[PDB]
Design a protein around this ligand. Structure first.
Ligand SMILES: *[C@@H]1O[C@H](CO)[C@@H](O[C@@H]2O[C@H](CO)[C@@H](O)[C@H](O)[C@H]2NC(C)=O)[C@H](O)[C@H]1NC(C)=O
Ligand SMILES: *[C@@H]1O[C@H](CO)[C@@H](O[C@@H]2O[C@H](CO)[C@@H](O)[C@H](O)[C@H]2NC(C)=O)[C@H](O)[C@H]1NC(C)=O
Ligand SMILES: *[C@@H]1O[C@H](CO)[C@@H](O[C@@H]2O[C@H](CO)[C@@H](O)[C@H](O)[C@H]2NC(C)=O)[C@H](O)[C@H]1NC(C)=O
Ligand SMILES: *[C@@H]1O[C@H](CO)[C@@H](O[C@@H]2O[C@H](CO)[C@@H](O)[C@H](O)[C@H]2NC(C)=O)[C@H](O)[C@H]1NC(C)=O
Ligand SMILES: *[C@@H]1O[C@H](CO)[C@@H](O[C@@H]2O[C@H](CO)[C@@H](O)[C@H](O)[C@H]2NC(C)=O)[C@H](O)[C@H]1NC(C)=O
Ligand SMILES: *[C@@H]1O[C@H](CO)[C@@H](O[C@@H]2O[C@H](CO)[C@@H](O)[C@H](O)[C@H]2NC(C)=O)[C@H](O)[C@H]1NC(C)=O
Ligand SMILES: *[C@@H]1O[C@H](CO)[C@@H](O[C@@H]2O[C@H](CO)[C@@H](O)[C@H](O)[C@H]2NC(C)=O)[C@H](O)[C@H]1NC(C)=O
Ligand SMILES: *[C@@H]1O[C@H](CO)[C@@H](O)[C@H](O)[C@H]1NC(C)=O
Ligand SMILES: *[C@@H]1O[C@H](CO)[C@@H](O)[C@H](O)[C@H]1NC(C)=O
Ligand SMILES: *[C@@H]1O[C@H](CO)[C@@H](O)[C@H](O)[C@H]1NC(C)=O
Ligand SMILES: *[C@@H]1O[C@H](CO)[C@@H](O)[C@H](O)[C@H]1NC(C)=O
Ligand SMILES: *[C@@H]1O[C@H](CO)[C@@H](O)[C@H](O)[C@H]1NC(C)=O
Ligand SMILES: *[C@@H]1O[C@H](CO)[C@@H](O)[C@H](O)[C@H]1NC(C)=O
Lengths: 50, 88, 426, 198
């Protein structure tokens, strides 16, 4: 699942069969690391208009 | 500011007329040495009418003023050839 | 059921019967008008080609679609602030209410700002702001940003307070030039004289008029605090903008004929020669969605601009003056109006003069005393059965028919329906 | 910057055509932007693939331009209706509407022609020099209350006068200037003064 963003430890309690997690706009907002059984939030890096 | 982080303009406390609208009440101007400044836009001179239950103000003179007002009426016609534009 | 158009009311018309109200009731009505909507700044490159390089190179081949869309959105964002300024900044000098509330019985403490609360808004303004009410993060992450307005709520509240203070301390002279102080009693007398009612009615029933005004303001507050559908016009625009943003942000979950809706799912499986078709289909679909959204936003902005122009016209004609236009500044004979701030809108409190209790009387178009036809100067001839009088139109105040009340023109054999009655000579 | 409202309209009408001409030069995914370059290098079966893309792109551009022109024409029609209303009201008459025929009390207006627009020279009546005076709702002379017919009572400190609301012209309070209505026990703030009888 290629992407770009800032990773942060999530507090969402994923069930043992919950691998990924999508947002309202069909975008991955949470992912489970395959090696370490931890939930990580996917947030795009800081941006904005100039 | 509430709109964002403005970098390059000095923050002043004096309230002037909004020249360059930035957003969220902040505007920019080019004043004095010359540099861009940012300030909270003002609304006008704070006045206080001397109201009373037995006081009235009646004018003793008048000034005839002429104020211009420009209003658009029409625009330039354009007949684009829908066939020649795509299949010249 | 078949909808009823209203109760059937048969008017007792006659060639010699007239109805003149013997009382009146001051009625205060509210009107909600949108003035602006939420700004939108759609990052076209991040929406169509979010975090991609080849997608941007393919999108640059289409032309200046992103440029013109951003230009239209910037024009909308500028014209929204332009409308807000043209509506809420009709004066160039902020006024302030005097510390003494010696108006004559009228209670304006419910529409003037309260120094206790931090936000310099009145009670009605607080109610209106409370009656109008994560998707925001999802919209922001896809390139849909909302720009803040130029004038904050505090500045709009100060403008409304200045307009209200000018209206209550100077009447309508503050709009045509410098503010001229005048007691509120004389202001209401001028208002009554504007609608065709003699000023003595106010100077004789000022207590009743003030009580009715206070009761009307209280009922307006109770109605705004009880129901949740009085500010539906602004909530409608808010919900429409929210639904448009939601549709624009959910259109990204469509394939448009491609193998996947995510660009990373295509750039990680196909090469640089086969994924071109899928990326082109996605770009076409998203660009069509953006064009549709921009067209809808332009039409909605035109509607909001029309509404804001109407609101500014109503402000200038009802608050800064006394408009004689029927059903414009509320239903009834307009006396005065007070503006009120509202989220992305304006609310007026139109004070109107409404007759209450009318009675049947016998009328005559003219009166002949010594072979000369007499016509009322300002009023109409009435008869209570035995005697004849002359009274104003919008109020029952009988007076003796004298030479100073009627003028002579013609003779008796020319007017149809003329009766005989003596004309007093002072 | 006096004719900025017309300058902006002209600039937008020119920029729309400029953007259309520039988008004419787009490729829209084809091998070239020029039609003759594609029609003279590829065979018919292979040329139609690019001709379809070019036609679709240019048709989308034309539709966008027509939609923008329709919206701008609706805005210009609204502005022209407003201008015609202002003409018929201020020029061909005297409108009592506040802040409609210029800021102030509208006296008259003179129309002026402008490129793709109209200019109105609104003449307004604005009071300049005001003075403070002591006012009163009515006058008590012989138990009755005297209300002004057209004007308001003023006092310069010692005497009472009656003058119009928009200009200071003091006159003696006579029976021909004020009318009698009611008594002098219900009016709030009433005062005492003599009423002259001619
Ligand atoms: C109303 O204002 C005008 C303009 O200020 C006054 O006209 C001036 O009067 C002074 C005194 O006589 C002259 O010296 C000026 O030359 C006048 N100016 C113009 C442009 O005519 C006018 O006098 C004022 N009216 C009153 C009653 O004070
Ligand atoms: C005009 O209508 C008002 C409102 O109904 C009348 O005021 C009421 O009059 C009744 C009877 O005189 C009183 O019992 C109420 O207390 C009054 N209400 C208020 C708020 O003052 C008024 O009397 C009517 N005028 C005439 C001439 O009948
Ligand atoms: C205008 O109306 C308000 C609200 O009815 C009045 O505020 C009341 O004032 C009294 C006396 O100070 C208090 O006992 C009440 O609790 C107040 N009401 C509220 C809701 O706070 C106010 O006094 C009125 N204005 C005038 C000049 O009397
Ligand atoms: C119609 O109005 C006249 C004028 O007021 C009434 O005449 C007066 O009536 C009262 C009581 O009935 C008497 O005290 C007065 O002396 C009468 N005035 C005169 C000049 O005669 C008359 O009664 C009214 N009629 C009706 C049916 O209301
Ligand atoms: C008003 O008075 C005139 C005369 O003062 C009345 O005219 C009379 O009408 C009767 C009936 O038609 C005739 O017989 C008389 O010859 C008329 N007199 C004159 C001098 O022409 C008139 O009828 C009265 N109007 C009303 C409504 O009573
Ligand atoms: C208020 O106005 C009256 C009327 O103009 C002034 O009375 C005049 O005062 C002058 C100055 O002494 C006398 O020459 C006149 O004879 C007075 N006229 C009358 C009818 O009494 C009065 O002085 C003014 N008061 C103030 C304070 O300006
Ligand atoms: C206006 O004049 C009337 C009568 O000339 C005054 O009324 C009198 O006032 C005095 C003092 O208050 C009382 O002793 C009398 O009984 C009153 N007479 C009547 C018939 O009411 C009135 O006070 C004067 N106005 C002012 C402001 O002084
Ligand atoms: C191998 O992966 C498992 C999870 O599948 C993890 O628990 C374990 O620690 C990993 N071991 C090493 C040596 O990385
Ligand atoms: C503006 O006011 C703040 C608050 O007291 C103060 O810290 C700051 O120095 C002021 N700036 C200027 C330029 O006076
Ligand atoms: C006037 O007459 C009509 C018809 O007789 C009647 O319906 C109406 O109630 C009358 N008006 C009053 C005030 O009684
Ligand atoms: C009013 O109408 C009635 C009913 O037809 C008629 O008898 C009477 O003469 C009319 N009066 C006038 C002045 O027209
Ligand atoms: C009227 O009185 C107020 C309050 O004292 C004052 O500010 C104003 O200047 C006065 N008007 C004139 C014309 O002097
Ligand atoms: C006017 O207001 C002052 C201050 O409250 C008061 O003393 C005076 O009695 C009032 N006069 C009238 C006529 O209301």
């Amino acid at each position: 699942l290629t992407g770009t963003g800032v990773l942060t430890e999530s507090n969402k309690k994923f069930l043992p069969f919950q691998q990924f997690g999508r947002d309202i706009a069909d975008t991955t907002d949470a992912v489970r690391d395959p090696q370490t059984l931890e939930i990580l939030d996917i947030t795009p890096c800081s941006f904005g208009g100039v | 500011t509430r709109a964002g982080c403005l970098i390059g303009a000095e923050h002043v406390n004096n309230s002037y007329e909004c020249d360059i609208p930035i957003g969220a009440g902040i505007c920019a101007s080019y004043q004095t040495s010359q540099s861009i400044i940012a300030y909270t836009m003002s609304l006008g001179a704070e006045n206080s009418v001397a109201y009373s239950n037995n006081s009235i103000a009646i004018p003793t003179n008048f000034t005839i003023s002429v104020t211009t007002e420009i209003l658009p009426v029409s625009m330039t016609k354009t007949s684009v050839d829908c066939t020649m534009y795509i299949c010249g | 059921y078949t909808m009823s158009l209203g109760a059937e009311n048969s008017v007792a018309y006659s060639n010699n019967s007239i109805a003149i109200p013997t009382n009146f009731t001051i009625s205060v009505t509210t009107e909600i008008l949108p003035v602006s909507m939420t700004k939108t700044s759609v990052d076209c490159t991040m929406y169509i080609c979010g975090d991609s390089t080849e997608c941007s190179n393919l999108l640059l081949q289409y032309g200046s679609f992103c440029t013109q869309l951003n230009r239209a959105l910037t024009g909308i964002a500028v014209e929204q602030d332009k409308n807000t300024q043209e509506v809420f900044a009709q004066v160039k000098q902020i006024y302030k209410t005097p510390p003494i509330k010696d108006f004559g019985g009228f209670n304006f403490s419910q529409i003037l700002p309260d120094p206790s609360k931090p936000s310099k808004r009145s009670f009605i303004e607080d109610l209106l702001f409370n009656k109008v009410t994560d998707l925001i993060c999802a919209q922001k992450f896809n390139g849909l940003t909302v720009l803040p307005p130029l004038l904050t709520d505090e500045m709009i509240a100060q403008y409304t307070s200045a307009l209200l203070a000018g209206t209550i301390t100077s009447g309508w002279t503050f709009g045509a030039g410098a503010a001229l102080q005048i007691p509120f009693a004389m202001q209401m007398a001028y208002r009554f004289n504007g609608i065709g009612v003699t000023q003595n009615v106010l100077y004789e029933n000022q207590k009743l008029i003030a009580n009715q005004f206070n009761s009307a303001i209280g009922k307006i507050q109770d109605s705004l605090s009880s129901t949740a559908s009085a500010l539906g016009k602004l909530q409608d625009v808010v919900n429409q903008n929210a639904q448009a943003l939601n549709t624009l942000v959910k259109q990204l979950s469509s394939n448009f004929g491609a193998i996947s809706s995510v660009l990373n799912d295509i750039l990680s499986r196909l090469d640089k020669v086969e994924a071109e078709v899928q990326i082109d289909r996605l770009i076409t679909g998203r660009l069509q969605s953006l064009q549709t959204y921009v067209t809808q936003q332009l039409i909605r902005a035109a509607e909001i601009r029309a509404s804001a122009n109407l609101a500014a016209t109503k402000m200038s004609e009802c608050v800064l003056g006394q408009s004689k236009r029927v059903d414009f500044c509320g239903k009834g004979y307009h006396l005065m109006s007070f503006p009120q701030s509202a989220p992305h809108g304006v609310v007026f409190l139109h004070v109107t003069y409404v007759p209450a209790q009318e009675k049947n009387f016998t009328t005559a178009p003219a009166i002949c005393h010594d072979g000369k036809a007499h016509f009322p100067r300002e009023g109409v001839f009435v008869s209570n059965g035995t005697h004849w009088f002359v009274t104003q139109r919008n109020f029952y105040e009988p007076q003796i028919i004298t030479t100073d009340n009627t003028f002579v023109s013609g003779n008796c054999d020319v007017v149809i329906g003329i009766v005989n009655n003596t004309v007093y000579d002072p």
